[PDB]
């Protein structure tokens, strides 16, 4: 039945595509015994391109079916093919490959993906490292809460990437930090994110718009995950810094924190003493029964 | 209208955090008071630099990537070994406190560094064998630590021949609440 279904995947009509992909997915879910691994790899290769379809139903079916196949067959061979694709593409379908890696991580277990993914990161070709970082960013954004047991595992690579000389690395690593912090929000990963915050913070004076944009997105995700009090603690020194550029940056960050966390900041403002003209002490909070 | 840095250090109660540029702010007293706030991590230094915070880190080559030891122990075909690596040997890496930012020379600075016993390579460079002996495994600096008494910066360490016995020196020298199980 299945080899007969294999040539139908290149049909251009969305109904045939959706139905055949769903059929292949159910076959891979509950009856993959009777099909060899090579045929499933062929199906995966044909399926990879359909992740960028305009119709959301075919994309959803493709995600489900790729997940079923990845759950059915081992992770190693399909993951090896995907990492090979990741290194040899450097084009638009690389993000397709990135989505497929995330699907494998969400459907199968991520401890079957992270070792091989990080060992491939040691090759010094740079563009492969940017691909690994983008794959990690989308992987964490896609798996969400499931990533809570893998923050420590990817913490050293992120330390390396956030301090690397290449600024594209900093931007994509900040994207990883944002997706991570938003995915593990409320599950006790405050210390690892605080550590990564110490590497994300010094890039707030970067001039490239896509980079400072990624930094601000990382800072907003970190405001959600670690809390506004820590972000305000990082902010208070430069709010009235002599340099106007420092004041611009830090007041932008303060504006983001304040818009996101106005009522919480009440508990986090520093003690500002009175002077000879004005009263700056919030005396009500100094009441003790 | 601007006062001197010495005058600002005189007026404020925390003259340690006052810098040269701090008098040029619109409100210098509020600036030094906010720098005297407790848990505020320092502003990154490269606001005053001119090299974009990492463009000087060029010539010092680095290893490409180090792996964590639990993943490295897998030889990266048995996925149960990988489950054990990610769930039975996954040690927490050395994290940092919120007040410790990053700069150019942070990687190459070695403040992370055990008194009374040097390393095996350090003892080999000092002409001392590694072992439990009390004749050559203590350093020659411990001879003055026996002659002139123990060093005052290590009061809990007992020097062999001065504060520790020679055969006893084998290295030349509440329950938690709410825990699981």
């Amino acid at each position: 039945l299945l080899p007969r279904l294999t040539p139908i995947l290149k049909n251009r009509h969305e109904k045939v595509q959706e139905n055949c992909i769903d059929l292949v997915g159910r076959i891979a879910d509950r009856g993959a015994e009777y099909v060899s691994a090579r045929e499933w790899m062929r199906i995966c290769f044909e399926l990879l391109e359909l992740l960028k379809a305009h119709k959301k139903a075919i994309r959803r079916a493709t995600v489900n079916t790729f997940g079923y196949i990845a759950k059915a067959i081992g992770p190693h061979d399909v993951l090896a093919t995907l990492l090979n694709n990741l290194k040899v593409q450097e084009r638009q379908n690389r993000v397709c490959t990135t989505v497929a890696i995330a699907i494998v991580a969400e459907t199968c277990s991520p401890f079957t993906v992270l070792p091989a993914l990080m060992n491939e990161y040691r090759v010094p070709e740079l563009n492969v490292q940017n691909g690994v970082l983008k794959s990690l960013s989308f992987l964490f954004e896609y798996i969400g809460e499931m990533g809570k047991d893998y923050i420590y595992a990817v913490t050293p690579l992120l330390e390396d990437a956030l301090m690397d000389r290449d600024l594209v690395h900093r931007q994509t690593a900040s994207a990883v930090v944002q997706h991570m912090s938003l995915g593990v929000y409320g599950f006790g990963c405050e210390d690892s994110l605080n550590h990564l915050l110490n590497y994300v913070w010094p890039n707030v004076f970067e001039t490239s718009p896509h980079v400072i944009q990624a930094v601000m997105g990382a800072l907003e995700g970190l405001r959600v995950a670690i809390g506004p009090c820590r972000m305000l603690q990082y902010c208070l020194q430069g709010l009235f810094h002599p340099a106007r550029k420092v004041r611009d940056v830090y007041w932008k960050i303060y504006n983001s924190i304040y818009i996101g966390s106005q009522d919480a900041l009440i508990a986090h403002y520093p003690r500002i003493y009175n002077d000879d003209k004005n009263t700056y002490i919030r005396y009500e909070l100094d009441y003790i029964l | 209208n601007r006062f001197t840095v010495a005058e600002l250090k005189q007026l404020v109660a925390r003259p340690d955090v006052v810098e040269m540029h701090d008098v040029t702010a619109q409100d210098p007293k509020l600036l030094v008071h906010l720098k005297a706030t407790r848990n505020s991590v320092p502003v990154p230094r490269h606001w005053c630099f001119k090299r974009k915070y990492l463009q000087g880190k060029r010539g010092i080559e680095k290893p490409p990537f180090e792996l964590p030891d639990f993943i490295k122990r897998t030889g990266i075909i048995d996925y149960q070994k990988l489950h054990d690596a990610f769930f039975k040997w996954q040690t927490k890496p050395k994290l940092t406190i919120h007040g410790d930012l990053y700069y150019e020379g942070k990687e190459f600075e070695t403040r992370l560094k055990k008194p009374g016993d040097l390393s095996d390579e350090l003892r080999i460079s000092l002409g001392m064998p590694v072992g439990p002996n009390a004749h050559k495994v203590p350093p020659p600096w411990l001879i003055a630590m026996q002659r002139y008494g123990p060093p005052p910066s290590y009061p809990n360490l007992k020097i062999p021949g001065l504060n520790s016995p020679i055969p006893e020196s084998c290295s030349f020298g509440k329950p938690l609440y709410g825990d699981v199980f």
Partner: peptide
Amino acid sequence: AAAAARAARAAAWRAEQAAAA
């Protein structure tokens, strides 16, 4: 190569998934 051991790797993955469940 990897193609000869692909069936063995798939069998090992199925055995690991049976043992994990």
